[PDB]
Amino acid sequence: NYPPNLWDYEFLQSLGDVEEKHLKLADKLKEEVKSLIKQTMEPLTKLEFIDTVRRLGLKYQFETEVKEAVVMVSKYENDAWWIDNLHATSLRFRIMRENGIFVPQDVFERFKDTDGFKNQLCEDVKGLLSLYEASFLGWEGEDILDEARTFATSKLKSIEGKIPSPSLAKKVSHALDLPLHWRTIRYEARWFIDTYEEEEDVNLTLLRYAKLDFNIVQSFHQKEIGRLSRWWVGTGLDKMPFARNGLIQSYMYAIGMLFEPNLGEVREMEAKVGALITTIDDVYDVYGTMEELELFTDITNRWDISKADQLPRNIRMPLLTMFNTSNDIGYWALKERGFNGIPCTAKVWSDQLKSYTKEAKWFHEGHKPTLEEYLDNALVSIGFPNLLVTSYLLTVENPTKEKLDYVNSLPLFVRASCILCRIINDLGTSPDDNLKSIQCYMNEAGASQEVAREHIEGLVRMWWKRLNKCLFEPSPFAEPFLSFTVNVVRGSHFFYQYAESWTKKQGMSVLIHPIPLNE
Amino acid sequence: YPPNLWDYEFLQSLGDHLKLADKLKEEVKSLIKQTMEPLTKLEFIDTVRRLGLKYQFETEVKEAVVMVSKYENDAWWIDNLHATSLRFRIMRENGIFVPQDVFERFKDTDGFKNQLCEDVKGLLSLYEASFLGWEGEDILDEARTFATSKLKSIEGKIPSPSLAKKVSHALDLPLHWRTIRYEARWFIDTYEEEEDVNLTLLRYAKLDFNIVQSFHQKEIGRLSRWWVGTGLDKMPFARNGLIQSYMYAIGMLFEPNLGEVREMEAKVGALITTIDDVYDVYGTMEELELFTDITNRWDISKADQLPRNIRMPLLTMFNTSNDIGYWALKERGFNGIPCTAKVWSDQLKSYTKEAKWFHEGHKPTLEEYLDNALVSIGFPNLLVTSYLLTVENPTKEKLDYVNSLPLFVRASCILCRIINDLGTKSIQCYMNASQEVAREHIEGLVRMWWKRLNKCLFEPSPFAEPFLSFTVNVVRGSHFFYQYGDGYGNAESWTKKQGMSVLIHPIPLN
Numbered sequence A: 001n002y003p004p005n006l007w008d009y010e011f012l013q014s015l016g017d018v019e020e021k022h023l024k025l026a027d028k029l030k031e032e033v034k035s036l037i038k039q040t041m042e043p044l045t046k047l048e049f050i051d052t053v054r055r056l057g058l059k060y061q062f063e064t065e066v067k068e069a070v071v072m073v074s075k076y077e078n079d080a081w082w083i084d085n086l087h088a089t090s091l092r093f094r095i096m097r098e099n100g101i102f103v104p105q106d107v108f109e110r111f112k113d114t115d116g117f118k119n120q121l122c123e124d125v126k127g128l129l130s131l132y133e134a135s136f137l138g139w140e141g142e143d144i145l146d147e148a149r150t151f152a153t154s155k156l157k158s159i160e161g162k163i164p165s166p167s168l169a170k171k172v173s174h175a176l177d178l179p180l181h182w183r184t185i186r187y188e189a190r191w192f193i194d195t196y197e198e199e200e201d202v203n204l205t206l207l208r209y210a211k212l213d214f215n216i217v218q219s220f221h222q223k224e225i226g227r228l229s230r231w232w233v234g235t236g237l238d239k240m241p242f243a244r245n246g247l248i249q250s251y252m253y254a255i256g257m258l259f260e261p262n263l264g265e266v267r268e269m270e271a272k273v274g275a276l277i278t279t280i281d282d283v284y285d286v287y288g289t290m291e292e293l294e295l296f297t298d299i300t301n302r303w304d305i306s307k308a309d310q311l312p313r314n315i316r317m318p319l320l321t322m323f324n325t326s327n328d329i330g331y332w333a334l335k336e337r338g339f340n341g342i343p344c345t346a347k348v349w350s351d352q353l354k355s356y357t358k359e360a361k362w363f364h365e366g367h368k369p370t371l372e373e374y375l376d377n378a379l380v381s382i383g384f385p386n387l388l389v390t391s392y393l394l395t396v397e398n399p400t401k402e403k404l405d406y407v408n409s410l411p412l413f414v415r416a417s418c419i420l421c422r423i424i425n426d427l428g429t430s431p432d433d434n435l436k437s438i439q440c441y442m443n444e445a446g447a448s449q450e451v452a453r454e455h456i457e458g459l460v461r462m463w464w465k466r467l468n469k470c471l472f473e474p475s476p477f478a479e480p481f482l483s484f485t486v487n488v489v490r491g492s493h494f495f496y497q498y499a500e501s502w503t504k505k506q507g508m509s510v511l512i513h514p515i516p517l518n519e
Numbered sequence B: 001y002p003p004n005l006w007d008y009e010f011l012q013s014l015g016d017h018l019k020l021a022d023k024l025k026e027e028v029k030s031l032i033k034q035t036m037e038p039l040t041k042l043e044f045i046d047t048v049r050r051l052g053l054k055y056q057f058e059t060e061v062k063e064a065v066v067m068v069s070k071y072e073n074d075a076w077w078i079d080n081l082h083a084t085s086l087r088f089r090i091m092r093e094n095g096i097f098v099p100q101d102v103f104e105r106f107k108d109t110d111g112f113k114n115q116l117c118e119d120v121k122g123l124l125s126l127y128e129a130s131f132l133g134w135e136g137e138d139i140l141d142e143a144r145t146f147a148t149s150k151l152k153s154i155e156g157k158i159p160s161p162s163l164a165k166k167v168s169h170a171l172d173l174p175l176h177w178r179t180i181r182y183e184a185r186w187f188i189d190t191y192e193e194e195e196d197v198n199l200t201l202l203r204y205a206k207l208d209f210n211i212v213q214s215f216h217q218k219e220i221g222r223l224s225r226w227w228v229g230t231g232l233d234k235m236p237f238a239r240n241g242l243i244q245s246y247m248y249a250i251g252m253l254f255e256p257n258l259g260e261v262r263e264m265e266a267k268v269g270a271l272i273t274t275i276d277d278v279y280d281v282y283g284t285m286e287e288l289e290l291f292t293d294i295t296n297r298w299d300i301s302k303a304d305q306l307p308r309n310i311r312m313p314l315l316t317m318f319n320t321s322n323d324i325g326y327w328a329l330k331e332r333g334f335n336g337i338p339c340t341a342k343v344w345s346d347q348l349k350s351y352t353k354e355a356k357w358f359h360e361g362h363k364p365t366l367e368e369y370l371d372n373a374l375v376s377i378g379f380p381n382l383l384v385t386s387y388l389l390t391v392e393n394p395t396k397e398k399l400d401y402v403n404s405l406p407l408f409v410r411a412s413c414i415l416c417r418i419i420n421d422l423g424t425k426s427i428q429c430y431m432n433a434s435q436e437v438a439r440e441h442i443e444g445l446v447r448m449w450w451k452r453l454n455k456c457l458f459e460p461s462p463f464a465e466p467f468l469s470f471t472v473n474v475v476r477g478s479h480f481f482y483q484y485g486d487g488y489g490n491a492e493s494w495t496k497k498q499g500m501s502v503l504i505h506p507i508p509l510n
């Protein structure tokens, strides 16, 4: 291709086209790790171990063993093992809440005096880092978790880059970039396999399984990218003079939303939809005229491609691929799930293009919307209602029009995720546009760039609190949609840290290069 | 356990010496170019053709044939029945006219001289040449009836192993009516038995066959994954649709360089067989009208009014037609969706007329039924699609023209339907004579339309390769497959065998 993509599509197909020795060894090491999760340990040691299993990307292999470990630890009658221990209190608080076992913010009170958190806690970095990490599991009105974040952030930053203990130095720097709660499972696993190997408390059996299982999952990913690349070259959209790296960037995002091998077909369909969202966003933003885009929108609204030949090739090809792929995805729901998803996929595309039109209307009129006007439209235009409603269609038991209507109605859980994805993307922009979060709020309140960014950062923390509380009352939603909704937010944080070199490094270590085994 | 050719589990698993091939290709290139006696040359390029290798040497074979057509001294074939017959056929095969009068030496005013009954090689070449004939070429008709009788009479009495095999093979189907790719597998075995076998040509035939087979295996993997993805493998009205369609497609075109077109033709074939069963066996009256209406308007709004087992074929037809039309836009610069939507609407209209006859108790003339039955067989759909995907600079104008079914295309489509009706309402329609006498009449229409096909290849035509080859090769596919459709017993094991030898099992080398 010209310009060049991150990797050539012929090479990406190369990848998928792990010796039987290793699958057998993997089942063996898996049973040995089950035994370790099950085995009697001191409660702190057990929490540390299952936190390690999670960060290595292995919770999906041990869901039963990890939850049962966590329930056991919540039943442990004597509290002396965590009381007055900042690290143990913090980790317990976090692991309990991550597993739907409530722990009050009051457990942190004893670490404060009249003026706030006790300055002397700065003498224990491991404790500060566990406090920092735990603070992100907090809800609205949990003021002590807000103080904990501010204090632990401030104290860790006063040492970032200058910690003379390699593994804690790396983890502190990594955490201040993004807290574990905000990071993807799959990209964290690759980073943490390296970190873990350098740590004092390393279990070589767990580490050996983490590398083996990483490589096996990666081989499924390599076959998916082969299929997706073949599909993408098949559409001819790799040759559009826009949306360079559209397919690989969508797929890398998808791995953040869902990495598990058993969700391969769903992941491939989400990656196809992301590649089309990126492509068609560029059709609307950096190619089409207002008149071309009116016809694109109208064809989509009516699901009628009669007039498609009035669009030039570079606009007609994206339109008809959106149409053909949406029909294929809808058809999969009929074939696999017994429910024709074409009305649903046609509807979320119509909603999305309507949001683009409103954005373009404002941009042409010169209109300068408020933050709340901007976000009600921009949470649609980012594409996550499309991606998430589609993910629900493809996974809900017994899909129905009424269920799909409900998800597309933005229950608080979904609205939070979509607003978060939009605001996180907007915060990732560097040198400047009246139609992004920061400038809309600047325009509203007469605020500076600095004060407006601080405001938007606060909105990020607030919507995470609602996300967190929604999981303690998941209401009509179940796995895997619960995970999808949170993990698209983590994808956004990871891919919009406030470049192509970083993206290639991430794609190289997670998708292309197996972890070297000493087996 | 034996691998099941009908198991989509097995078929989905398919896909998962080139230096010697390129070396031996140049050696074979050199053998077609090197000087030989003009008869030995014709024999050599006929051998190349029959080994399914002509596609590798189109330019060397044509120039060989042109060189022989200019060889000035005729002493090498005059009064030699084999040589006269081989020259006739190879020349006409290459669009160089030879009159039927070259077979004057071998007949008088009373016909072919009964003396020739001992001359097995001669009789076989005469028989094969006769099928290159046109209408009113009555010497070629007489050569056929005569060669056929004399060949039947000597069959089990031929000492040469390879000549005995060739006579028995020719009497089932002349070479002209056989597919290239299925014949290539057969002929590799027979050729190895011949006295004049060229071991370089035989080694390259095997190597190229296995290389091309590996291409087809990747195609069947992709197509089987697609078919399982549609869910149509789990439908009632089942008939191993995809694998059968693919086995037909291989008769229509086998060349690796036509892979994508072959896959799309195989998909359309699988959908035609499936939807025909929807209209002929499973669908209610009200269901078929909605299907037809949805297709006519290319509007799937009301799809949900159809039950699962009908909605799935419908949406797959819609989705696949949109994909194929899209491929034309992407690859050929022309949006083919209006074209694929039209050939499906026309096909479903042929299904509506079948029912308007059955329910109104109407009984059509042979000419009436065949006007409709040449559309319903689905070869307009397949051939118009093949033209959309291959024609240089496609346009609506050119697509309306092919879809009007001018003689060349109409002859192929009638031949496909007639050949099919010969192997189980063509016979019933002509009868409304008896069974035996209609059949004999319909066999006659086969010979007739073949002569019109043959002539079309000499006449001015908008059409070029590869569509000229597609149009003749569907007819060969029909000849080869038409009497093994039943899907049990002898029919099923002969089909499985063809499937296994040409698609699955490589040719052992050394």
Ligand SMILES: CC(C)=CCC/C(C)=C/CC/C(C)=C/COP(=O)(O)C(Cl)(Cl)P(=O)(O)O
Binding pocket: A249, A250, A251, A253, A254, A257, A270, A271, A273, A274, A275, A277, A278, A281, A282, A285, A381, A382, A383, A387, A425, A488, A491
């Ligand atoms: C989870 C998944 C499969 C994601 C697919 C990739 C998608 C569609 C990501 C949406 C976020 C992206 C890539 C934003 C970059 O696009 P931009 O043109 O800057 C824009 Cl933020 Cl959409 P906008 O057009 O509003 O300025």
Ligand SMILES: CC(C)=CCC/C(C)=C/CC/C(C)=C/COP(=O)(O)C(Cl)(Cl)P(=O)(O)O
Binding pocket: B244, B245, B246, B248, B249, B252, B265, B266, B268, B269, B270, B272, B273, B276, B277, B280, B376, B377, B378, B382, B420, B421, B474, B477, B485
């Ligand atoms: C060259 C190519 C890709 C062929 C694809 C396969 C196709 C469409 C084969 C058509 C011949 C077949 C399988 C006929 C058997 O079907 P039938 O229902 O008996 C029938 Cl002859 Cl179509 P009809 O409905 O007229 O009785």
Ligand SMILES: [Mg+2]
Binding pocket: A281, A282, A285
């Ligand atoms: Mg954009």
Ligand SMILES: [Mg+2]
Binding pocket: A281, A284, A285, A356, A381
């Ligand atoms: Mg945009």
Ligand SMILES: [Mg+2]
Binding pocket: B276, B277, B280
């Ligand atoms: Mg039928």
Ligand SMILES: [Mg+2]
Binding pocket: B276, B280, B376
């Ligand atoms: Mg029929």
